[PDB]
Amino acid sequence: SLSRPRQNYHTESESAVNKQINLELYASYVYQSMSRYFNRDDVALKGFHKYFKKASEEERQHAEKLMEYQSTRGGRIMLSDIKRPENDEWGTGLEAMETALNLEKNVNQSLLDLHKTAEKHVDAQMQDFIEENFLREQVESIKEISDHITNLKRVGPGLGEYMFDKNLSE
Amino acid sequence: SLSRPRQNYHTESESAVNKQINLELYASYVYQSMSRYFNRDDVALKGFHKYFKKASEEERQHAEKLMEYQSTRGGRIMLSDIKRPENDEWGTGLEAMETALNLEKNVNQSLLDLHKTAEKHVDAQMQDFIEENFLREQVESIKEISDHITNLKRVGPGLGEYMFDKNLSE
Amino acid sequence: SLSRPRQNYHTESESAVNKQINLELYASYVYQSMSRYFNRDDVALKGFHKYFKKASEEERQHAEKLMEYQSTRGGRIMLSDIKRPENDEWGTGLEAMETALNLEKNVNQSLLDLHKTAEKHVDAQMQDFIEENFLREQVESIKEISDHITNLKRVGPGLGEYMFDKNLSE
Amino acid sequence: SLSRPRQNYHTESESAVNKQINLELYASYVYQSMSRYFNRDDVALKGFHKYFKKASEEERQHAEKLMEYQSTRGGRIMLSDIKRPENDEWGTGLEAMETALNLEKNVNQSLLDLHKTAEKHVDAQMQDFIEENFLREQVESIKEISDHITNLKRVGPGLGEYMFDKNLSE
Amino acid sequence: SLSRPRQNYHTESESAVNKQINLELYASYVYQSMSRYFNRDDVALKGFHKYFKKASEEERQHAEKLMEYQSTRGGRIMLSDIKRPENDEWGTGLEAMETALNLEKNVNQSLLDLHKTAEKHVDAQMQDFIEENFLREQVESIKEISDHITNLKRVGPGLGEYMFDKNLSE
Amino acid sequence: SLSRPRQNYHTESESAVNKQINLELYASYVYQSMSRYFNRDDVALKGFHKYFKKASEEERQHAEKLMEYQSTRGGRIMLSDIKRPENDEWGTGLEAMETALNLEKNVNQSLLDLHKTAEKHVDAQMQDFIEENFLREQVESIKEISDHITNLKRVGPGLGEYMFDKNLSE
Ligand SMILES: [Fe+2]
Ligand SMILES: [Fe+2]
Ligand SMILES: [Fe+2]
Ligand SMILES: [Fe+2]
Ligand SMILES: [Fe+2]
Ligand SMILES: [Fe+2]
Ligand SMILES: [Fe+2]
Ligand SMILES: [Fe+2]
Ligand SMILES: [Fe+2]
Ligand SMILES: [Fe+2]
Ligand SMILES: [Fe+2]
Ligand SMILES: [Fe+2]
Ligand SMILES: [Fe+2]
Ligand SMILES: [Fe+3]
């Protein structure tokens, strides 16, 4: 028996949503780790700390939006282990911004694949859901982090990193 | 000669819009009937009365939005009889929620087919109009009614129906 | 056996109430059709659009008042198909006001026959219900539409129609 | 050697965005010219002046939205000459509204071709961006101008044109 | 060499803080799973949904306070995989409250062991941190959950569960 | 036959006003290009972006002031192609400020020549119009840009540029 709300919602879409939930939880964990590292006494960049805290929270919210969507469509949420980040440490502000862009792009390609899944299965509603709730945000973020990387190179290490961080804080 | 505004609007889309206008007006009528049945002295469930009143109003508003859209694109509205509902009476609260779910699913499949019409004819604007104004709402409604059916089964007949109805009223 | 509330409510009155419900819903549909027609790109009279929208809504409200009354008295609402209007278009502002007057008079005569049903069966409460909630409004409406027809004749086609329509909008 | 933000953004799309930019800047210039013309001492229709001023501004805003989008995706803005309009004058209010409708339709077809480009390259983000920022507005404009042309024909020359112009002014 | 802030902070304390961070993240994930389960269409208990949402947020907050504390003392945060919960599905309200109590007791025993660690290494500040920020909250939660279980047993299944859930929603 | 308002308005002045309209439009387009260049991901100087956006808008406004003036005097606006800027990309902040100064001085010379036209033809009203609405502003912009170039040299590349851009933003 299909679940009562189930209508035009393929099993491959359902599976793919579960995968995407894990990815976003993972991304939130990476950002968490990045955030806490910048508040170490021997790193001490509170603007990077704050920027990656926000990132972490946003990723977790996106995972939760996917959880809700799964149940709304009549799919069943299947959770997996949230793997630990690749690194304990994250280097300079610039390095960590480069790390963040790579993660964002990874998550973006996963979202575009999830969109392609929905399209294949003629799931118009799921297409819209993804476009509105995920895709726009992702291209804004990629643009912003890329701007930050240009500026971190432009200011250089030492005082430059310190002044960039202050302006991240605001 | 086409109408002045007409641009990228197929006759099949135009026709399908008129069929959907009828469908939504029909659905409004069915909810009208349900609504008033629940205010009978020998039924007397004001929460269900209110819930199906709102449903009826919302289905008329969607028919009207489709009427407006037809003329905006340069289509011509063609109206047909609004058929009377299948029943005069609607049973218990649970029965009526099951009837509601079937109607919402039927309306949703028609919307999905209207979207496929728009897509076949490469009517991007129409696909967007349908996704934003119809498809989102329909999946919310399907989920809500499914929740209600679970809770009506969980409370049982009698006092349980009465208490659920109070909660619908708020 | 009779319904629990029922007292001094004849079967003929109950039947006639059902017929009146259909009539008013039909009237609402005619005014819906008129209203939309006036927002076509090749008609484009927003004052007439608004006027007939209001009319449509009012008719539906009166149908709904009769639905409620039927159940208040212990009668049973019996719905029928809502027939499609006799036309798809509606001509000039003047033509459509003439159409409206004929519809209002037809609905008035039905109301008056419904009152006579109530009087025949010595249903004083029904008579009072009909006078207060329907008859007064109908005389006012018939007068107003008559006034509009004199003015539409007085202004003439073209600019005059346009300026009448602006005043309808207000 | 792709730009840092670049992800799922075809060169075809990039170049089509540049062409659209030019087209909207052109359209803004046509509307500028029209707007000015209607404030000539020998034309003197301030409501048409204002209507085409607004249109000019909106077209420029949409060119600028496309400029911002190009850079957001990692594309590079390439500007071309903004060609001067086909005419120095613009005739009557009615003639100018006919001109405006032809311009809007032509901009709309370009937008629809831009959407087809995006679709062909499986650019889901781009599809959405065009739907929500461009396509909706364009169908509304086309309908409005079409309504204005009906009314300008209804009112006729002379006093009729003067009264329509007032109403445009508000 | 030790980190700059390091003073009176044992490696065993540092290690045990990392273990506790993992445990609280794990507990937050179990509560996440429970919370979403309760909003399934075929479960539909919004009060349990909300209760476990709040539980999940609080657990995450307590993990984050441990992260901050690790870095404040000069320790180094070490993250591990956050294991998926034991179940995908969580039964009745009553079953899930029993599950929650067993989780809270396990988290409390770990906190008490963490306090023993701090005491063995004569870390007065740590003891005070644990008492104030963790231990009080835990005994309250354990009391509250225990009260809920008594009440869930007292109301029984069906309507009783529904009414308890309303009261949780408040 | 002259236009009705025409008085003391030489054809050479009318011509020269059309040329100045084009110049200002061209200057607005140059600044628009400069503006959008500084928001590229690989340039990322939002203060410079803002500064040249304002410049672009101001130039447009001054073109439109000339447009209005032409029609006020009874002249006839004649539009020409707005040529595309000399460059696609505009170098560092300092380079672009040097570009801006040269543009400003070119536009100021044009204004001075337009004043000389008006003076030759004993057009006292025009001389004033130019002095008040154009000449004052242009010596302000020339002085401010000159100050900015001194400070861009003072601060140097890298962090200095970054900090000057922040101050531009404010
Ligand atoms: Fe995300
Ligand atoms: Fe993100
Ligand atoms: Fe609907
Ligand atoms: Fe609905
Ligand atoms: Fe009526
Ligand atoms: Fe009426
Ligand atoms: Fe446009
Ligand atoms: Fe969309
Ligand atoms: Fe437009
Ligand atoms: Fe905890
Ligand atoms: Fe807790
Ligand atoms: Fe200027
Ligand atoms: Fe200037
Ligand atoms: Fe009376």
Author numbering:
A (entry chain B), B (entry chain E), C (entry chain F), D (entry chain C), E (entry chain D), F (entry chain A): 2 to 171
What does the paper say about this structure?
For marine invertebrates with no adaptive immune system, ferritin is a major intracellular iron‐storage protein with a critical role in innate immunity. Here, we present the crystal structures of two novel ferritins [Fer147 and Phascolosoma esculenta ferritin (PeFer)] from the marine invertebrate P. esculenta, which resides in muddy‐bottom coastal regions. Fer147 and PeFer exhibit the 4‐3‐2 symmetry of cage‐like hollow shells containing 24 subunits, similar to other known ferritins.
Subtle structural differences in the putative nucleation sites suggest possible routes of metal ion movement in the protein shells. However, the marked variation in the electrostatic potential of the threefold channels in Fer147 and the fourfold channels in PeFer suggests significant diversity between Fer147 and PeFer in terms of metal ion aggregation and cation exclusion.
